[PDB]
Coordinates of C-alpha atoms in Angstrom, one line a residue:
X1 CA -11.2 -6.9 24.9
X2 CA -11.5 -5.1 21.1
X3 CA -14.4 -2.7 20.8
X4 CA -15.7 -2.9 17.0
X5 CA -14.6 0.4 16.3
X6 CA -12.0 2.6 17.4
X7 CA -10.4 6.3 16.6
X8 CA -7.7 6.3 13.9
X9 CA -5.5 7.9 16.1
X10 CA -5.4 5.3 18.9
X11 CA -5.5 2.0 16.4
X12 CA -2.4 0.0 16.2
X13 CA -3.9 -3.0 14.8
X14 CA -5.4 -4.7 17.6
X15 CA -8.4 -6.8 17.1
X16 CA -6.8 -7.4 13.1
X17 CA -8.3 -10.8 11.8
X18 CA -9.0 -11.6 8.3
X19 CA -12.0 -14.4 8.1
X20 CA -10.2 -17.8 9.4
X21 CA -11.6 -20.5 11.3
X22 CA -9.8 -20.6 15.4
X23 CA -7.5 -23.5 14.0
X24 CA -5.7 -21.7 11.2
X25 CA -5.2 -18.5 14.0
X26 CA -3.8 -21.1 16.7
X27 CA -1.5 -22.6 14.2
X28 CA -0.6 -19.2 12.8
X29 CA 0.7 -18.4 16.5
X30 CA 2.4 -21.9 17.0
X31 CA 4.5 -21.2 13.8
X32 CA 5.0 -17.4 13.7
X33 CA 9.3 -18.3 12.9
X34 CA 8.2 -20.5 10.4
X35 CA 5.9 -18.4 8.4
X36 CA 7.3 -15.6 8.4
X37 CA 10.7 -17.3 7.2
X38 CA 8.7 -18.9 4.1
X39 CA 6.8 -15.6 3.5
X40 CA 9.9 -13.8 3.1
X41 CA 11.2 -16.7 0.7
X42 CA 8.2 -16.4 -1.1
X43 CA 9.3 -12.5 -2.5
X44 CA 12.4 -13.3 -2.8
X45 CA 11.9 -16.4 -4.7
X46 CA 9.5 -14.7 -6.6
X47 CA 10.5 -10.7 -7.1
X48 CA 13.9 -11.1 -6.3
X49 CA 13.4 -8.4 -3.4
X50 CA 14.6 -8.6 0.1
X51 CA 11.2 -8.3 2.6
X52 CA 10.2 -8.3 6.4
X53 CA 7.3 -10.1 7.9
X54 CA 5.4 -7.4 9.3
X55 CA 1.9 -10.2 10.5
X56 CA 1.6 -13.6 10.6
X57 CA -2.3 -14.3 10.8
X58 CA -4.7 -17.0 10.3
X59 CA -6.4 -16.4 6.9
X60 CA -9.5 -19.4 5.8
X61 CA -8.2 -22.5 6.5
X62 CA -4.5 -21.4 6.1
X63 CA -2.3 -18.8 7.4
X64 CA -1.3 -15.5 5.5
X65 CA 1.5 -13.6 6.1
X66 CA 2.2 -9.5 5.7
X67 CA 5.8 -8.1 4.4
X68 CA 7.6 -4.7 4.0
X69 CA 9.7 -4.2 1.1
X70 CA 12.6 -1.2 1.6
X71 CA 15.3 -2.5 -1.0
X72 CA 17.2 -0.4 -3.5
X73 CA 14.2 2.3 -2.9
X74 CA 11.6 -0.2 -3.9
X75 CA 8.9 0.2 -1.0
X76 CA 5.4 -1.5 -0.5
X77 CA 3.6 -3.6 1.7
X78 CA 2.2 -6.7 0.4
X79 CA 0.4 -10.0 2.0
X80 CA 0.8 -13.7 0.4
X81 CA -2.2 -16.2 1.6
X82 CA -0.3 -20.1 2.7
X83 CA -1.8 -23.8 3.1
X84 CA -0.5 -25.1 7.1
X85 CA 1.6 -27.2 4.9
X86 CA 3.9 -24.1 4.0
X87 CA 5.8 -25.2 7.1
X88 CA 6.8 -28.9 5.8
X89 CA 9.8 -27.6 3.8
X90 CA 12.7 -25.1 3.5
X91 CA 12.9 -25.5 -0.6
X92 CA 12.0 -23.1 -3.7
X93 CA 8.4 -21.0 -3.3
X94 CA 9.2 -20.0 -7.1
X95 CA 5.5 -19.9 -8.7
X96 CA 3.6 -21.1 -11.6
X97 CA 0.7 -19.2 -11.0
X98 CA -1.0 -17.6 -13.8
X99 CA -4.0 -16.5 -12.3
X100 CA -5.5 -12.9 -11.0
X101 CA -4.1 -13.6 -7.8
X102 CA -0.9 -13.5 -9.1
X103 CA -0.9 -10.5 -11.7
X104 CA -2.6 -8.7 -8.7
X105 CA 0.7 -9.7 -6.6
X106 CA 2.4 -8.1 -9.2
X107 CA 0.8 -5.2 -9.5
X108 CA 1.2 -4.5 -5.5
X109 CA 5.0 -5.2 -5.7
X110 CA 4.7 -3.0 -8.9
X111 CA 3.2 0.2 -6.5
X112 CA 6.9 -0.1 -4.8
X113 CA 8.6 0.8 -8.4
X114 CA 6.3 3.6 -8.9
X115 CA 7.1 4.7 -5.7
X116 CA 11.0 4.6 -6.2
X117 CA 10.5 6.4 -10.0
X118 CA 8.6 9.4 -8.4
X119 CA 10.1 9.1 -4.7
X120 CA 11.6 12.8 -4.0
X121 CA 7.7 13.7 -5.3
X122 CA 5.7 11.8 -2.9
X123 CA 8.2 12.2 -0.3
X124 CA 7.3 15.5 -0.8
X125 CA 3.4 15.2 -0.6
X126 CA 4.4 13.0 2.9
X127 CA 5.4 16.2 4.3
X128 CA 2.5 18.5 2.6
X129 CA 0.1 16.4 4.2
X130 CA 2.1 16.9 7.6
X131 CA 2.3 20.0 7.3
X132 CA -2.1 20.2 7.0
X133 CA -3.2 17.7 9.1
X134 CA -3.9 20.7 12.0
X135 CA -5.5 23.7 9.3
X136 CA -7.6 20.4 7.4
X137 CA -8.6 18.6 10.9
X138 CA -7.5 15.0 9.9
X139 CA -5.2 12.5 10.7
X140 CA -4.1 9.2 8.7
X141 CA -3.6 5.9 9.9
X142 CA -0.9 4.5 12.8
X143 CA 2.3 3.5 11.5
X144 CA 1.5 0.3 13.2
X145 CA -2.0 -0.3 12.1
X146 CA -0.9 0.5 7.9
X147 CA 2.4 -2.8 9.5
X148 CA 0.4 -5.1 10.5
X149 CA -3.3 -4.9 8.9
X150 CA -2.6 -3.3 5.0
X151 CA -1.3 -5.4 1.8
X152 CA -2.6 -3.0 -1.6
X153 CA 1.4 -2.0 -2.5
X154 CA 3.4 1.6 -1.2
X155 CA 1.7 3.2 1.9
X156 CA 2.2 5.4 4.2
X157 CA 0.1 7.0 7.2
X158 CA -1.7 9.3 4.7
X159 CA -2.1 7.8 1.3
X160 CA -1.8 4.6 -0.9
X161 CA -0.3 4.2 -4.6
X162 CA -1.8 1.8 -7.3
X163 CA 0.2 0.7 -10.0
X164 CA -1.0 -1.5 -13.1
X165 CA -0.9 -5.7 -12.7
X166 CA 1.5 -7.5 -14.9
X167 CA 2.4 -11.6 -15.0
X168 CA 5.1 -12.9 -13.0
X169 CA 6.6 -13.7 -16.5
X170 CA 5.9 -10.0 -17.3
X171 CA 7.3 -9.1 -13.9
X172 CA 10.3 -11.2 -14.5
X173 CA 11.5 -9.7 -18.3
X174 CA 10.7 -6.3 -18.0
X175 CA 11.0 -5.1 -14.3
X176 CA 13.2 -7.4 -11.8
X177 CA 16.1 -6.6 -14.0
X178 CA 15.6 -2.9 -13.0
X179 CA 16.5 -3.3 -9.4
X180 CA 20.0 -3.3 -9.3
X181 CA 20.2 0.4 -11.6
X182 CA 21.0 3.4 -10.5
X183 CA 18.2 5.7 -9.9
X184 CA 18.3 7.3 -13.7
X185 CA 18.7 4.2 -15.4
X186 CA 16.0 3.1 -12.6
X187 CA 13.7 5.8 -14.1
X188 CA 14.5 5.3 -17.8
X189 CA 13.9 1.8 -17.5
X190 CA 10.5 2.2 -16.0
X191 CA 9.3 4.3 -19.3
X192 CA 10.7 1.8 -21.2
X193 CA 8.7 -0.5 -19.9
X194 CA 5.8 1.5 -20.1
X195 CA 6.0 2.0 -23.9
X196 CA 7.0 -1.8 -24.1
X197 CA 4.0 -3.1 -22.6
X198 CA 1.8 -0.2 -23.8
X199 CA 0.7 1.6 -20.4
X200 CA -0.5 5.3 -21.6
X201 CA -2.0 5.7 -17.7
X202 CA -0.4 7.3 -14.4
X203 CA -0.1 5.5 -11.1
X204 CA -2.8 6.7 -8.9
X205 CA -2.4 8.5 -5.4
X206 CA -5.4 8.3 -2.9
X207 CA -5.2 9.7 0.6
X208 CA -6.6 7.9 3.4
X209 CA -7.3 10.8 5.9
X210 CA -9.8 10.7 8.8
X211 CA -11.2 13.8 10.3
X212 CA -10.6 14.5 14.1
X213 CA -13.8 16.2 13.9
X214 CA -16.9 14.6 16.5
X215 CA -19.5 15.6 14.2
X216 CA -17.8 15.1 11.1
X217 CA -20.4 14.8 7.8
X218 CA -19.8 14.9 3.8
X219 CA -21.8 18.1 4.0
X220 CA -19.5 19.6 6.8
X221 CA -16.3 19.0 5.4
X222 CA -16.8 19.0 1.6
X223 CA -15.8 23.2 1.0
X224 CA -12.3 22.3 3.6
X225 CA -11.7 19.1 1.0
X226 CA -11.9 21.7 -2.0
X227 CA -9.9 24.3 -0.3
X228 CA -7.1 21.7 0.3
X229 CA -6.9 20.4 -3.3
X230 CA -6.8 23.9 -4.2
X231 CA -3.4 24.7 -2.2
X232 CA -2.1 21.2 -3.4
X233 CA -2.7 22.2 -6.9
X234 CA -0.1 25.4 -6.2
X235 CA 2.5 23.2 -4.7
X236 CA 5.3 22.9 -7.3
X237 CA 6.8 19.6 -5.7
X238 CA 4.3 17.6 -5.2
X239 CA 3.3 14.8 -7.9
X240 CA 1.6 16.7 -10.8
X241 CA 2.8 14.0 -13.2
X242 CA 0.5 11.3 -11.1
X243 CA -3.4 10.7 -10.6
X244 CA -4.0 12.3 -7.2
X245 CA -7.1 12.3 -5.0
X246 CA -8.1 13.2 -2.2
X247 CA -10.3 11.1 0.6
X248 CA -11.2 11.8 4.2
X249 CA -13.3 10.2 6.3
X250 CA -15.1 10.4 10.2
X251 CA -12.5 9.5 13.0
X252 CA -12.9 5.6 12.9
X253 CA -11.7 2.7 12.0
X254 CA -13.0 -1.5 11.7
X255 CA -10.8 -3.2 14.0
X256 CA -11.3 -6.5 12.8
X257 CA -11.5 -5.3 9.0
X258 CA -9.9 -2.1 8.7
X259 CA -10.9 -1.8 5.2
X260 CA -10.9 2.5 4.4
X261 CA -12.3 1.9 1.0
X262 CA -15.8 0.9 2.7
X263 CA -15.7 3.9 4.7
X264 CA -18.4 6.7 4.0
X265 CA -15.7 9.5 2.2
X266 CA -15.6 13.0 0.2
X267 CA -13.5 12.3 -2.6
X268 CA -12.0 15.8 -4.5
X269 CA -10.1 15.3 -7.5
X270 CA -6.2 17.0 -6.9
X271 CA -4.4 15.8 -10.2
X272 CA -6.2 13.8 -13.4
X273 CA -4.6 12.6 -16.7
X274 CA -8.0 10.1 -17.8

């Protein structure tokens, strides 16, 4: 069996299930091939981006299906909910929806271009946060468990970016067309669409970091949290240019709904441009 809760360290995902009834999970297993095939469609259909299916799960009466984007430097990790009837054909997934649901879509796929026009940066805070995991006492998530069980945009072990929501037709004239550039056209179309669209705020940064600590408390750890943004403030590489915070959290994780934003955390503030 799952226990409810489990270290960081040790989960891979096990025990993942958003709310769905037993139906929708069977069926999600019986078509795995399937879905996965028409989730992938979906993006491409959609974003014009090349995607893996990372999870095929049941999701309320339907199925849902999680991808990982790496093409042309665009990275993120994304989910896309389907009816059981997603299986009944092979032909266009191009969508008409106009809704929240949507512009939220976007704004996940959108993290992915924020990550490619600041990449050598947060590469660069990837390895910082390496580099302290054994001074700071933490660890992030599995590779596996951030696969198979996370959908908000670009993420990695430690942290998670957040980019701004746009409309697929938003999506469509001012960023798909910027896939194929080269990295400085890449760049310079990015603040182009920025001024375009009138966006004045920074991508935010947010580490997801859980302390190996047994006795771990807000209290405990709060003056190690500010010592840490302190020697992140003096790194020269890292991204000053974004919104970066900094989160940690005791050693577990939800199986079922491993959800780190409903965790009990210490927030300290790294990098702010509000």
């Amino acid at each position: 069996s799952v226990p409810e809760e489990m270290e960081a360290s040790k989960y891979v995902g096990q025990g993942f299930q958003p709310p769905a009834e037993k139906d929708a999970i069977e069926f999600s297993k019986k078509h795995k091939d399937k879905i996965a095939k028409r989730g992938e469609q979906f993006f491409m259909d959609n974003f014009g981006l090349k995607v893996k299916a990372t999870n095929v799960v049941g999701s309320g009466d339907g199925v849902e299906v999680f991808v990982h984007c790496d093409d042309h430097d665009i990275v993120f990790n994304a989910s896309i909910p389907f009816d059981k009837s997603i299986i009944e054909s092979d032909s266009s997934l191009r969508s008409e929806d106009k809704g929240d649901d949507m512009s939220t879509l976007v704004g996940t796929v959108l993290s992915g271009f924020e990550y490619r026009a600041h990449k050598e940066e947060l590469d660069n805070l990837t390895e910082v946060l390496k580099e302290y995991k054994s001074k700071y006492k933490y660890t992030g998530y599995t590779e596996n468990a951030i696969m198979k069980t996370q959908n908000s945009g670009f993420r990695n072990e430690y942290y998670y970016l957040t980019a701004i929501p746009y409309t697929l037709d938003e999506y469509k004239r001012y960023f798909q067309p910027l896939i194929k550039e080269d990295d400085k056209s890449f760049r310079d179309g990015m603040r182009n669409s920025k001024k375009q669209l009138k966006d004045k705020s920074r991508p935010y940064v947010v580490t997801t970091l859980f302390s190996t600590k047994d006795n771990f408390t807000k209290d405990n750890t709060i003056d190690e949290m500010i010592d840490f943004s302190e020697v992140l403030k003096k790194k020269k590489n890292i991204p000053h240019d974004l919104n970066v915070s900094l989160q940690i959290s005791n050693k577990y994780i939800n199986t079922k709904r491993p959800n780190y934003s409903k965790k009990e955390v210490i927030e300290v503030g790294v990098f702010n441009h509000e």
